[model samples]
Target: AAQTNAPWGLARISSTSPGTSTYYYDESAGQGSCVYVIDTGIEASHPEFEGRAQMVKTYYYSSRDGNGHGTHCAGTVGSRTYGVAKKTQLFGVKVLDDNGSGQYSTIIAGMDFVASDKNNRNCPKGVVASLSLGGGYSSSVNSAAARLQSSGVMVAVAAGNNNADARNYSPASEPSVCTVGASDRYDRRSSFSNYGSVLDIFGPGTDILSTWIGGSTRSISGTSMATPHVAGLAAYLMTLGKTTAASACRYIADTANKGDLSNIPFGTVNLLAYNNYQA
Candidate 1:
């Protein structure tokens, strides 16, 4: 059965225009795929995860998500109730601190961890990493993310929330990484989202509801919230046999609904992210 009372992001991705109130998706969803949520951390015990999510790597002393950003992003990626890939396994790679801030070195360390993880490095089911964080342009961070993608991890990153050109951000500015911007349910670019030629695609980000700390849920907005939706969609594509990072990125663009979004900057791609789901 289709999920009723689905989040706008879910419904927006599965259907074409005139947004529906329900979400439709393949039952397999992201089964057999793994999505690495590399952010603050995840609330692994949240009921919404159904035990599919776990904190696998953390630079911090604790494995918990005191900041809630990672957990919220994880929920959007694959939580049972508010996710795009309902059955995908979620592994948290905590690089950002409780305040959702971190140094570039720490972020790279987390990327290195996921890139070398035994399960992810060799998983035939496909692997993806969602980076809902970014900073000023840094070649080192760009190189690290590209290295992970070369290792077969499809990386999706936020274009930052500065409302400026994404070319000014690291990781997001990296041409090899799938840089994503924020879009609203109305098919318009979120005003705060970074734009321009560096962005690869747009995903619903405004007022998104997802799992949070303490077994609760909350709604927030940011390009951070949009990145995981694409990451989840990438995992869903992996389960469909688009196992390679490049292939998944191609399919995402090929299947995307085009030219519907408004208020997009002149150089930004007009395509909105889609799941390619069929009944």
Candidate 2:
């Protein structure tokens, strides 16, 4: 694979001081953090993440990464070439299929798997669980996420792509977790992204380039594309001694450019999710 530079989503948030354009290529940022992507599985063999990522468990037979969405999200979470913390270990909890379809129960099961120490024993401390799917509000999933946060798991979910209020969506709308909305290369909210009070921050989701299913890379867009950026940021923060889920979410929320986003409301100056990872 011939690559020119780090992916834009990763580069935009890395330590981009002079002579540090190579920061994304290094693995020092997230050495002690782990990212668990709850989505449509991952390409366990994707070259960019071969050793850094693995398929832990799947609702279906084998985590074959039927669709490329999960792999791409995982890459953004922490891949050698397209991530925030290049060295952060990656794990998967398959809940969606090729059609991007799955039930809330399946997602809950994946959440249970992530929360169970017996299952994720091999994972490290400061775990950030990333979910890039959305459905209507569900009491069960909300309750499950609240418990998972109480158990020390940092969760980040997409604010949905429907351009409506995120309060009506589950998982994202759930309390005690970071809900991410999508922004474009220009730092504006994507037209398709859900907004309103439920969103915690925004991330580069439009035309995001990352690892795909065939050991390649692809560009995709969605609030789905925004969730992992927050997850990666959470994991990065974890490595910096910010262990609790609340602290991680706070750093992101406090650093965001509230003035830049219309959804953030007037009088707010910084609450739209900006990069602050030693950059």
Candidate 3:
């Protein structure tokens, strides 16, 4: 339910090494990994995503562009022009419409769709499913996420954008889901990002620059943008032969940038340590 693109200069810093001419490539690249982005539908023909996108499936629970929220989220995660997972295949599942909302049942159906595909032939191996939306936490939802995690599907969810405690959100708070919180330019928790012990890691979320509808570019801020950062990391991990969601999440947590956080609530989680865990 958030809109308005903000400038995300940090994306360059996060995606590329300071002196490297080539883009900062996560270890997981060109290993033929597929990722499912369960959100709004994608443009599919954006120029920034040439030869880098393959849509295996498209599902729309609501009218197209219901609220443009899912499109924005999906673009951030997999849009070739500005996506974190540019080289990975992205499957768009439209659980939410242009209104930027949908029923929980629809979202679950989207999850089931990806999990039911057992033969890697259809979905390919090293599939990481990223979910940017969630209801409040529930045992049933956790069970669903656990089932997917058990089957080697990495699930990443937004830790909710509310400034209050993140315990109120569902899939994000679920134990099976890799909960992602948002950080600012200095890698501190965003004022709007929900934080809790449930959070698995943090990413550059404030004023994130990403592709938008109709081939324009802009920035947005929130845990939503942060979620894709982790999602892209998962795609990178999959390329490095990390298949299971648990392992992927662990790899990210272990490698994420951990700043001085003794002053903040929940201490600090490492974003850069994930690099050492790379296989």
Candidate 4:
């Protein structure tokens, strides 16, 4: 994967084109894809969203992101300046609350709700789903992921921020989900990101600048942030016509930039969401 060295100045700039961006995947900008940021919430009218974002409250509680985590993830998924899939429909599914926490069960409920076609014009198109939240293992969660996959939904999940082997977590460990590990601007595995067979790929997550709760840009780092990078790339892939979930997974693993990095399992890591298509 071509690396973006932040502190290499990507964080200092707001444009996705900064430093002659490596992904080079701006051709489509996810014009017709949909990525559901199943986390806290988003500022639906935030200028970065450019009117394509919508907030859905799955828990009856407000889907608004008070802690900046969810919105930051949202920014990476669809914001015009910070995201990969710049034109995709950005939907905030508030599974977590303002305190930056939520129940594992709630996550499943949110995915289920958003997967329905009748949900709305903004209903999930089975293109890509970005999840930055996870807990202990849940059979139900894995099952839901599989169900969504069978229906052509590409689910991207965080490999956890514990710095431990990713196999111990729920959604990350779930085979149906594309578990994402965190990498820095230099393409090195983040010190706090989990690694293991459960992980499918790595993405830029260190000091990543994206939309924040205040409708401004903020830099953050974590596997939580990395998840959306892959999500955005996957959404960008959707614009290239790989709508089948299983097919998308196959193409990602098959074509990912995998020559760099150590410490993770060999032959199991595709170290970045590439823009190898549009260019």
lDDT of 3 by residue, 103-215 (tens): 87777777777787634434354777778787776766667777777777888888888776667777877876788877766546688777777888877677777766676
Better of 2 and 4 by TM-score: 2
Each candidate: RMSD: 1.3, 3.5, 5.2, 4.0
Q: For model 3, where is the 10-residue window of minimal lDDT?
A: 1-10
Best by TM-score: 1
Q: Which parts of model 3 have CA positions greater than 4 angstroms off?
A: 1-23, 26-31, 51-66, 118-125, 242-244, 261-263, 267-279
Query: lDDT per residue, candidate 2, 106-222, as tens digits?
Result: 888888888884244554547889999979989898888887777778889998998888888898888688888887765567788888777777777888888898899989999
TM-score for every candidate vs. truth? Answer: 0.97, 0.89, 0.82, 0.87
lDDT of 1 by residue, 93-205 (tens): 99998988999999999998998993544446789999999999999999999999888889999999999999989899999889999998888899899998989899999
Q: TM-score for model 1?
A: 0.97
Quality of model 4 by C-alpha lDDT: 0.73
Minimum summed lDDT over a 10-residue window in model 1 is located at 117-126
> Which ranges in model 4 have alpha carbons more than 4 Å from their true place?
1-23, 117-119, 122-126, 265-270
For model 4, residues 139-211, the per-residue Cα lDDT tens digits are 8887776676666678889989988887778788888778988877665678888888788887777778888
lDDT computed for candidate 2: 0.76
Q: Quick one: ranking by TM-score, best first?
A: 1, 2, 4, 3
Cα lDDT for residue 249, candidate 1: 72
Better-scoring candidate (lDDT), 1 or 4 = 1
Q: TM-score: which is higher, 1 or 4? A: 1
